[PDB]
Amino acid sequence: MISLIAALAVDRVIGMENAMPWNLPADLAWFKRNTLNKPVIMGRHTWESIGRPLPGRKNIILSSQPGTDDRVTWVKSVDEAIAACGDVPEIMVIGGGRVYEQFLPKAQKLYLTHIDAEVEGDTHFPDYEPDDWESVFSEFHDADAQNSHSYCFEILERR
């Protein structure tokens, strides 16, 4: 099973200048809980944005050019990325925009955080047909001293 996980601001913005400008510790905690002990697939730009391997996860990087760091696994195509994960129950695709576009048609589950924040971005989550997805979990949270925006955790499963 392939799943995508992402945090979306207003208008499906996911990034600006290869960064995420907001800071929501509760969402990063949700990301860690849902990805720990699973393989994570990311594109090269997202690898450079994170800046280090994510501990406790098999890190697989998509790039057309040779890898430059043997602490992670480098692959050259979508099919190779999936194969490098082996026989696991759930593969997590962690972005960015171009990678999400390629894996969306193959995904059975979306873990989405909807952040009530307006930011001027250059990267968006793919348009996804709402009729194809059933919401099986949603949990709203108001802003607090640690999290400066309200946010909604949602899990969607392909119908």
Ligand X SMILES: NC(=O)c1ccc[n+]([C@@H]2O[C@H](COP(=O)([O-])OP(=O)(O)OC[C@H]3O[C@@H](n4cnc5c(N)ncnc54)[C@H](OP(=O)(O)O)[C@@H]3O)[C@@H](O)[C@H]2O)c1
Q: Tell the smallest beta-carbon distance from residue 54 to ligand FOL (Å).
A: 5
Q: How far is the CB of 25 from ligand FOL (least distance, A)?
A: 7
Residues in 105-144 at the binding interface with ligand X, rule: CB under 6 A: 123
Q: Which of 9, 27, 81, 133 binds ligand FOL (CB under 6 A)?
A: 27
d(CA 106, CA 2): 7
39 binding ligand FOL? (CB under 6 A) = no
Peptide bond into 86 cis (omega under 30): no
Going by the DSSP 8-state scheme, the letter that residue 54 receives in this structure is P
* 78 interface partner picked from Mn ion, ligand FOL, ligand X, none, CB below 5 to 8 A per type: ligand X
Of the candidate residues 100, 103, 107, 113, the single one contacting ligand FOL (CB under 6 A): 113
119 is an interface residue for ligand FOL by CB under 6 A? no
The item of ligand X, ligand FOL, Mn ion, none sharing an interface with residue 117, based on CB under 5 to 8 Å by kind, is Mn ion
> Is the separation of the CB atoms in 156 and 135 below 8 Å?
yes
Contact 91, 85 (CB under 8 A): yes
Asked if 144 is part of the footprint of Mn ion (rule: CB under 5 A), the reply reads: no
The reply to whether omega before 56 is within 30° of 0 (cis) is no
77 binding Mn ion? (CB under 5 A): yes
Burial per residue of 126-145, b for 16 or more beta-carbon CB atoms within 10 angstroms, e otherwise: bebeeeebeeeeeeeeeeee
CA gap 6, 102 in Å, rounded: 14
d(CA 56, CA 92): 13
92 has binding-site annotation: no
Site for ligand FOL in 79-98 (CB under 6 A): 94-95
Residue 31 interacting entry, from Mn ion, ligand X, ligand FOL, none, C-beta within 5 to 8 Å by type: ligand FOL
Q: Binding site residues for substrate, as ranges?
A: 5, 27, 52, 57, 113
